[PDB]
Symmetry: D2
Subunit: 276 residues, 4 copies
Amino acid sequence: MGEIESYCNKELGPLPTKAPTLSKNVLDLFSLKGKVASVTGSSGGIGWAVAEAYAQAGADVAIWYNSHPADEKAEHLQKTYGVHSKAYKCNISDPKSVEETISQQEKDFGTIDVFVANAGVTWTQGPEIDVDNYDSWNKIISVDLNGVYYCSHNIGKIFKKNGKGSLIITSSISGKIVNIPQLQAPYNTAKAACTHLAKSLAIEWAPFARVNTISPGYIDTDFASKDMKAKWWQLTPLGREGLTQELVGGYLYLASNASTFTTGSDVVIDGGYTCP
Amino acid sequence: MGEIESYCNKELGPLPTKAPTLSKNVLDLFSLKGKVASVTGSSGGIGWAVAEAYAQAGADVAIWYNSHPADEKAEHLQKTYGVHSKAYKCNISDPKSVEETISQQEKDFGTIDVFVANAGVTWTQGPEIDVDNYDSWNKIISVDLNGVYYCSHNIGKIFKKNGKGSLIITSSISGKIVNIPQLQAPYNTAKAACTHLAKSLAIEWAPFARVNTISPGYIDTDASKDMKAKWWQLTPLGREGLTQELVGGYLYLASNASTFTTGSDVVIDGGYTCP
Amino acid sequence: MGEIESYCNKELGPLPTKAPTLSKNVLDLFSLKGKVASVTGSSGGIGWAVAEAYAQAGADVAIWYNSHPADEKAEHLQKTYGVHSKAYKCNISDPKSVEETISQQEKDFGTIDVFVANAGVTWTQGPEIDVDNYDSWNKIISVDLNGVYYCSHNIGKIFKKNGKGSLIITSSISGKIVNIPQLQAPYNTAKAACTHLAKSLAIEWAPFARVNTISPGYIDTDFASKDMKAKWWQLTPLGREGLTQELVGGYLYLASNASTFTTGSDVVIDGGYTCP
Amino acid sequence: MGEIESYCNKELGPLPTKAPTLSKNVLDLFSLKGKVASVTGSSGGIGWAVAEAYAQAGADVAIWYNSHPADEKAEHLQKTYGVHSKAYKCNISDPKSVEETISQQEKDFGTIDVFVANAGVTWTQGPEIDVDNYDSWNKIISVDLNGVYYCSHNIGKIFKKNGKGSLIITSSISGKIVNIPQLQAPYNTAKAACTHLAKSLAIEWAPFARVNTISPGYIDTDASKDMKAKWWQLTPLGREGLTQELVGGYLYLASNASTFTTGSDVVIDGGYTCP
Ligand SMILES: [Mg+2]
Ligand SMILES: [Mg+2]
């Protein structure tokens, strides 16, 4: 009695919750100064571009790696932008490794304000009907779904401990559409799972954090023939693949105070690919 | 050169593919006379409803169980409707088991025309943050996603061998929305996966089969009072559904009533996903 | 006090509402015997196929026409299936004509149980940037949106008077995706509007009726070159255009007691076109 | 022959098209320094928030009004941020008016780089079945859909002439879900139309412009208590949003921060569309 109780999440407490106090200047909303970001898969590709953009925005950055040493990448951020950066080696497929890596990052930086769950794996084996060995399926799920959940489960405890945070899960247009002509049902499945995990966690963590996805389309960064890429261009309204530098604005948007009412959303950056 | 080649799947051959001959009368399109259906999770709940309606439509039905013997339920189908029916035990979380089960089923009935992948593992443990056993996460992913993929992977080979088939994956409104107030992110995740797996397989199997999902809302089958009251308040029709309100959609997707329907998600939820 | 009040629609009364009593036989759920259906745009194409399938299911059928006489079509249903059928001439763009036509149909058949709002118009003028005359835009909206709303607004009063009904709005994949290579923004806009009108009405009419859409893909029934259709086939997972006879099962599904828990839904029949 | 021709729009020319040069520093991508923005419905509410944030980002801003004089609001922008600004009166429901307004605006500022189509007609009359005046329906469709199309139709010619542009259409969560308990089917219909119009124009304008939507949830701008309480109960964040929580997205879509973003729908709703 005497309380408007949420239908979504009672841990919100009596409603309405209070809006944050923000700068009246839109440009200040995007600064990450005074914040710690942890960006997985940041030894290259999208994760590196996001890690570097967050440093530009003023954030201390924990980069992750596994196959290739990124200590000099983390050192490069320190030297270039005057920000604390350290690199961490971890197999995202191993939940104990994730727990220890996250626990260690909390010690070195003090806290974590922004987390980017950036799971990189692809399915290149064609139609699944001819892949009788479930090791390919199971490897996609372990890295691209379980590995994303391990990171989320651990970072949510830190967000709740601190009463604040912003989790970004890197999904894909493959979470919304079925890629053609390269058939990759297992990858599309894990990415769709990622997208709806982010929305589910958005409800569960709303008293202490925001959760959103970025869904990139075809970004210029393997076994893609010229005639395959040609078909991608033909079906993309802008007519080309994107650049990693065209993703960083969306990742900064979701990481910062520019999006404090944005949760459970999927920011699609795909040159229009999902529209036809 | 000279052919129109699909951008979706070159196994379609030169385009356009050709349409089937269909009955002149709309009611005959829904008949399963002459067909074999295999319905997982069929010892009760939604699965049993579907298996019985398929026999009413005239189908031989393989029912599945895991908990209690369903042989008598299969005998009821055989007795009441005059069709072939048998019960099979399998842990769909184990691929050898489902492979051997589906292999045995096509031996026993000759073929499989209609398959319903129905997973039944639920998440009852509240917000995931306080559940430090990935055992519950792993259990949901293993049965509700991996298990559905094992059935799919195996039934596709049969459909491709025969050049025909209809796969229905039972998903949930949880594949589209986030249930409240009972928080169940792992369940929602697996059901969204199933929904997009179906769409992906629809492209891959298009030369020989259709793949669609049914997404039920809140169905009163075989939850606190205040919880259910909130579900009712948020449901446009104002109530939970009955299993008899699902079988029409399952028969639609199973039969020649839907021969141009593939990769679709048939939502049966009293409007729940609309507000 | 003493009442669970809907958050959706208080006219539902105290919750839960009561489920209908249905046949225990699935095949009986699809019969339309004892019911009156009104199918607009039924002088040919999809509307004719639906009108004939409903007669096969046992329903009395009111067919609509405007440009071509359908009296002999309505007469053909009577002679062939032993069902009451009459044809009505009406310009769906004129709201008074719609009101009078619906009011007249209620008299002749006694009631209306099933209504199919089947608005037929297309945009063939290419990209809108070069159509400076708004008469093309306004004609699409008037027929494909306003005309659908006129029919709905009028049939809802009859459904509410009787406490029962099933409205089906014929939408299109164009309501969900952007057709290519033929550019038709005005048509896609009206069809998207239709799809979300159906969901909106589903909430508002839930005490007395169900509202759903059928969204056909490319169905073989104008100014479509061979190379245009070729591109449609290439992007369609089944690899072909559909037949009108592949739509009637979905229209029967939504019209009958097979779908009494189905409301606010969009049944897509498109050979998979919206999946890539 | 020899070229790769788009399946979306042959006006793209031989594929692939080419990417723009962009600033090395992510913060510079958000600058509107050197650009002209035109924001409809800009005498207050969301529109004014957007117009002021664009000037903060360094943009010349044309503001629109229809009710009260906004010339002073435009003078405030000119005074506080050191940019060009002017207020224009127009009934966006009348195409001659918006055509003449937009023509006058490109004359006064030289060009238009960013356009925000923001319609503000709301439906407050409850369930449509008791509203026998299509005057309210026609009013919503005329302003919230036709009016948005008139602005779009006219600004596209400018973008195409200049080979550059970003159009943001303000839609609503009402374009995706059905608001409860206040029933407003005509508003929901027009907003869904706007959302798909934006996607359609994104394909058509791709050789020279980007088109995206912002879909705000419940924003407390300038409704009974029990009504708002239910909105809060159904919002995952547990509150209404502030206009200052929208301007980040509007600046993202307006600027070179989003040069690969087109046909997208940026939802800012506290999670409302998730359950
Ligand atoms: Mg598509
Ligand atoms: Mg909802």
